[PDB]
Scaffold this active site. Structure first.
Site, PDB file in Angstrom:
ATOM      1  N   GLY A   1      33.168  32.285  37.174  1.00 16.02           N
ATOM      2  CA  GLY A   1      32.335  33.480  37.096  1.00 16.02           C
ATOM      3  C   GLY A   1      33.130  34.771  37.050  1.00 16.02           C
ATOM      4  O   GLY A   1      34.175  34.863  36.390  1.00 16.02           O
ATOM      5  N   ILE A   2      32.617  35.764  37.766  1.00 19.79           N
ATOM      6  CA  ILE A   2      33.243  37.077  37.860  1.00 19.79           C
ATOM      7  C   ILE A   2      33.631  37.386  39.302  1.00 19.79           C
ATOM      8  O   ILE A   2      33.100  36.792  40.248  1.00 19.79           O
ATOM      9  CB  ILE A   2      32.300  38.198  37.360  1.00 19.79           C
ATOM     10  CG1 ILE A   2      30.948  38.102  38.065  1.00 19.79           C
ATOM     11  CG2 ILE A   2      32.147  38.124  35.866  1.00 19.79           C
ATOM     12  CD1 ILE A   2      30.430  39.438  38.575  1.00 19.79           C
TER      13      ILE A   2
ATOM     14  N   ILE B   1      38.122  36.399  42.890  1.00 22.27           N
ATOM     15  CA  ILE B   1      38.549  34.994  42.972  1.00 22.27           C
ATOM     16  C   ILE B   1      38.790  34.367  41.582  1.00 22.27           C
ATOM     17  O   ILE B   1      39.907  33.929  41.305  1.00 22.27           O
ATOM     18  CB  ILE B   1      37.652  34.123  43.918  1.00 22.27           C
ATOM     19  CG1 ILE B   1      37.928  34.502  45.379  1.00 22.27           C
ATOM     20  CG2 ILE B   1      37.929  32.619  43.697  1.00 22.27           C
ATOM     21  CD1 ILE B   1      36.868  34.042  46.386  1.00 22.27           C
TER      22      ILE B   1
ATOM     23  N   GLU C   1      28.931  28.937  32.545  1.00 23.70           N
ATOM     24  CA  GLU C   1      27.707  29.718  32.548  1.00 23.70           C
ATOM     25  C   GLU C   1      27.982  31.079  31.872  1.00 23.70           C
ATOM     26  O   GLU C   1      27.245  31.502  30.966  1.00 23.70           O
ATOM     27  CB  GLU C   1      27.250  29.859  33.999  1.00 23.70           C
ATOM     28  CG  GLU C   1      25.939  30.488  34.215  1.00 23.70           C
ATOM     29  CD  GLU C   1      25.657  30.574  35.695  1.00 23.70           C
ATOM     30  OE1 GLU C   1      25.356  29.516  36.283  1.00 23.70           O
ATOM     31  OE2 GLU C   1      25.756  31.687  36.260  1.00 23.70           O
TER      32      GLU C   1
END
Lengths: 447, 447
Positions: free
Chosen positions: A215-216, A219, A238
């Protein structure tokens, strides 16, 4: 041609378009960056025309005005994933939250459980054949278009044309409202030493040719920064971020060793800076597909050497993972976390891994430190990734394996990656919880 | 032929067979009714020969002696599903418990996460071609035979021959121990008014031609007894028991409208009375297949009009379902509960349903009455079926839909099916939890 007449006949102002919403309607916005701000503004400005209109969506970069207490007689926010501008309503009681897996959203729409009276969507103006492009969302947006009783479109000429299942013919849309404004952006995060260390541990689990989901935030950006020595990585995710673009132009991600959708980054939505939106535009290396394809565990199971990277908020001694709430306070949603955990576990090659990562500690606003490795979840917290789903857990201190591991060994592994300051307290909690000594060793040297 | 010499050369006593186990080994028993009691007895008798031998299995009808604390230097029980004869060890601290989905067990064995040094299985004596039959288990048993370093077989001529993936050639087995004794049986449950009411509610959700999954106990038997007016029901289930045989003999279950494994009851193990074992024997209407087929969510998704019926222990206001623990005390395991919940959710026909049922109340050890519909799960309880997984919840008071429903609406529905004596206390808790009244209605009559 014939379509140009349809388009022209159905063009109106935003204030006119939102008159098609009536009291008791279920209204849904297109996902994330595809949310039409001019239509949303008009609906909110017209609040006094409405009684008990449900407003649903997932993550939003908009103002979430309809969710404020003053509008509670006009609108009921029903979030399928909450965010800073809408989570207040859920805490206060006038807003609602539905726990739903991201991959399942299109199914719930089709089943009419998520009935849609009015769908509001931002799209590009039509191409030569009358097809508009959503550009930055496919997700549940495409199903919503088919299932909604009325579709209202904000036609924004700053929306990119991106390949895949992103196209809607003008004949499928009821009203068009022409606008021109940039798409919302998210900034690039600061990466601390904690996140850098997490990225390095995550990178050690990723082999050449891995298919990634991430994702964003700091991390995944940290993970990506530590992949510069890797080769032939692919994407089935995703979303992708600005960070993925960087790794692509570094030559690390080339999608050449994928099992399905070969040579393409397969995604369900986009969120980042305009650099990402420009990259994705008219790009054979990028393809948007609906969320009941991308996030479908049966589809993820077909991916080669799948590595899924997701973040959580706390993990208990049993490997119950809390990712979307802090005690009774709702913060986000499951989104696709469990979709990808499951897909990786089901992997047909048997090489799938799911990594759930988090800092080992948080600093409370009172200045005290708290462990995010805990004997028990916070009171009233929702388990996001169940103990039976849990795979790898990663902090700045290392990797803990949950899969096929006993409660005691899970707790031992988690304590081993907890912050040093908390280890003795946690071992005392271990002994109380399990009625067993922490150390499995017993050397005759110690009587 | 060649095989007869192999069999005869490898035949020995139980006491000789268990000398194949050495200190440090991971030992696995065949599932449930296929557990070899003569081999287990010999292993426990030979306890002093062993240091730190891990003993794994799932539900057991055996004595679980190796799990008692007096054996803790010799054996470590590692349950993948616990039961009355082994659960004490987990509470006491010297027994271990692994949270693992039933369908994933063969995968963990294949991955060498569930490494098996010695597998102990009960089988029928060989047929003419040298094939022994497990008869009552396919589940993880077939994979364990393939993957185990050593296989020890108890050859019991009371084991039935049952079709499907249940056959093992004598060349796959290291030692054979010949015995003759009946298979363990479980009793028929008593159905009270509460369970009868649950059965009626569940039956109201089951249409003609549904494919069923259900287990054992008063609830599934009550459901079956309310199905006498249904037609062309099919079976795709982790197990069948005596109740299913009754319904088949009544002509209600004929498997004639299944999408896959047409005309057959597809199952992964058997547990019941000898009537069930005799029924299943040499029967074209029954087929055993391994658990990574039967319980695989991608396979369940292919079933027509899937209805999955499972029991739980408590359900909180968010639709978190606790099915296998009582607070910090481990009771059973997830088994295939979530496997079938996910399969029904993923159903290709969009018709799948998962039902989780329970009595609304219980009498605790101290004699006090408690609601199993609760504001919050018991402290330290494991969530079995997550809030995002939840579908239908049923008590004697009716049906509550979780799927696509908000936290507040889930809690309202659950309170609606709670025992009348607890409803007011539960509504008080609703108000405190959600900052909203149970009735979302304010009337100017009361300001």
């Amino acid at each position: 041609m014939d379509w140009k007449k349809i388009y022209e006949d159905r063009t109106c102002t935003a204030d006119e378009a939102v008159k098609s919403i009536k009291s008791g309607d279920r209204v849904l916005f297109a996902h994330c960056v595809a949310e039409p701000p001019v239509l949303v503004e008009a609906m909110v400005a017209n609040a006094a025309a409405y009684k008990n209109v449900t407003v649903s969506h997932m993550v939003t970069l908009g103002k979430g005005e309809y969710s404020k207490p003053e509008y509670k007689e006009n609108f009921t926010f029903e979030g399928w994933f909450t965010s800073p501008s809408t989570r207040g309503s859920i805490a206060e009681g006038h807003g609602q939250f539905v726990p739903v897996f991201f991959h399942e959203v299109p199914s719930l729409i089709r089943k009419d459980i998520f009935h849609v009276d009015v769908f509001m969507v931002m799209v590009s103006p039509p191409d030569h054949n009358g097809f508009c492009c959503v550009g930055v969302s496919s997700d549940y947006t495409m199903q919503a278009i088919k299932s909604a009783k009325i579709v209202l479109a904000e036609v924004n000429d700053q929306v990119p044309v991106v390949y895949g299942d992103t196209f809607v013919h003008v004949s499928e849309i009821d009203k068009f409202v022409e606008t021109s404004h940039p798409l919302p952006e998210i900034g690039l995060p600061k990466i601390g030493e904690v996140e850098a260390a997490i990225g390095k541990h995550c990178a050690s689990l990723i082999e050449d040719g891995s298919t990634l989901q991430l994702g964003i935030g700091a991390i995944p950006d940290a993970v990506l920064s530590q992949l510069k020595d890797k080769k032939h990585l692919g994407i089935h995710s995703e979303m992708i971020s600005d960070g993925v673009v960087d790794l692509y132009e570094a030559g690390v991600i080339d999608c050449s060793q994928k099992s399905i959708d070969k040579g393409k980054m397969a995604i369900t939505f986009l969120m980042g800076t305009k650099r990402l939106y420009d990259f994705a535009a008219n790009n054979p290396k990028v393809e948007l597909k609906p969320v009941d394809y991308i996030n479908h565990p049966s589809v993820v199971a077909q991916c080669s050497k799948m590595v899924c990277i997701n973040a959580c908020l706390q993990v208990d001694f049993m490997g119950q993972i809390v990712s979307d709430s802090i005690g009774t306070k709702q913060f986000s949603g499951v989104g696709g976390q469990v979709d990808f955990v499951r897909g990786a576990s089901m992997s047909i090659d048997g090489k799938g891994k799911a990594i759930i990562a988090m800092p080992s500690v948080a600093k409370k606003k009172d200045g005290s430190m708290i462990s995010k490795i805990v004997p028990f979840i916070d009171h009233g917290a929702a388990v996001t990734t169940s103990r039976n789903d849990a795979d790898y857990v990663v902090t700045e201190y290392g990797i803990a394996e949950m899969k096929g591991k006993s409660l005691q060994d899970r707790a031992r592994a988690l304590i081993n990656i907890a912050h040093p300051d908390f280890k003795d307290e946690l071992k005392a909690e271990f002994e109380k919880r399990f009625n067993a000594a922490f150390s499995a060793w017993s050397h005759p040297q110690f009587e």
